[model samples]
Target: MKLTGEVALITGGASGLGRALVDRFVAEGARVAVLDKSAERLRELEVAHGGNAVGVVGDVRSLQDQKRAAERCLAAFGKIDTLIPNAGIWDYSTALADLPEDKIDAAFDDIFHVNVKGYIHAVKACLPALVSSRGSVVFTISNAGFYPNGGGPLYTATKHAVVGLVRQMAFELAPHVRVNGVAPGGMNTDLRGPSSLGSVPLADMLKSVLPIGRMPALEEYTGAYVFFATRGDSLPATGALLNYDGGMGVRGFLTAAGGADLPEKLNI
Candidate 1:
């Protein structure tokens, strides 16, 4: 019960990585409120939590909707201790050269609105509660935020923009409301892509590429979010960016593990 009595507001908490966060937080003795567009799934999550959580059906990209989500959280949980901007869509790695000129505009708009604008709206709606509680905000980032190939230009750009948002918001909300980010590399989830590029198996595609050699389970990534949500556990961590991507920043061309023989060579 690391998070006992704490309350969290998570966007896109109905499925994918977001759902893992919700489950983990509840297990740690926290109350959670979810904001997602999936009405049926939201209802199911609410029922599963059985009064420990409340699910609000709302679009993240809409300020009014985001506000409504915050209101619902306060109505249910009484206060919001943490806010997680975890909702987003991918572009499926559609390269610049192959991007359809006609579809480019709509695709950019859709991806950015969901991935970037949605995060901004989440923060905007939860700012007041955060200020009052002196709480924390955790943004869900991707490997695409720092490196290429994880996504195409659109998806990558939106994630990079989120990085900028984290830094700026952290600085602005400092000394009162702490802000940070967690960049997960790859995981098996129902993450969807833009209709223009079509969906792809994001985790399976990266299985061989990540240095870890396999895609991690959705539950594995929840711990990082939990750490950030736990007040005493994450104090003095504002503006921090955790590269929780199974060594993607350090990979080799021929072998994922270059030091595999080190222990044997040492003759332990």
Candidate 2:
């Protein structure tokens, strides 16, 4: 097992991508601590993983809640080898001009507090333990971090701010703790947005934009986190941002992928 004897603390892990990471990490022999708002879902996760996981019901935006989760992880598993700040909200691609003026201020706070501040809080809460263990932090960034149209102004801006976090934190925590990010593309998750902005149907809209031509499953994205958390495998990595979004940055104007017929041209 790549992560045998290691431990991970993940936020927003009651469902979706974070939940997938929890399952994958457990399978790799790592104990997990999840911080999430859903007590019922957290209970289900603890039941599913049995002794391999613990759930701490809380909000990621609060440093105290994050601190409690860190304490729980340390108490349960003894040390935290990886911290995955995965909680986030989307904006459903609402254009700036289309945004409701009355809702903008509240919406901005809602998204930023969860997406940006939550990440900072996770790191801060785990800083001492991480330094002692020489652990790593793997952030959950999105395609919106690099490109336009992945989200509306609010969501996009929050993700862009995450890119800055990955870089800055890596620098600040170097020589003791490594920091990096994984920017996954669209996935059909129960990812909610601010009440002010609402949500969308992601798959159909991403069909033409994603160069891979299909939306990836949540499980598919968990491998990148595993790679970052694995010791020896990613020792030289820090301040690295892996674009695990299936070629979103390289999509073509007319077609997402220009070599879709490559298999036919190189027939067996």
lDDT of 2 by residue, 1-268 (tens): 8999999999999998999999999999999999999999999999999999999999999999999999999999999999999999988788999889999999999999999999999999999999999999999999899998888889899999999999999999999999999999867676578887764355544556778887778899999999999997999999999998878898888777888899999894
> Compared with the true structure, what per-residue lDDT tens digits does model 1 show for residues 55-164?
99989989999999999999988899999999999887889998998899999999999999999999999999999999999999998899888888999999999999
What would the TM-score be for candidate 1 when compared with the true structure? Answer: 0.94
Off by over 4 Å in 2: 199-207
Predicted structure 1: clash tally: 0
* Overall local distance difference test of candidate 1: 0.90
Model 2 residue 252 lDDT score: 86
Residue 104 of model 1 has an lDDT of 95
Clashing pairs in 2: none
Predicted structure 2: clash tally: 0
Error of 1 at 258 (Å): 1.2
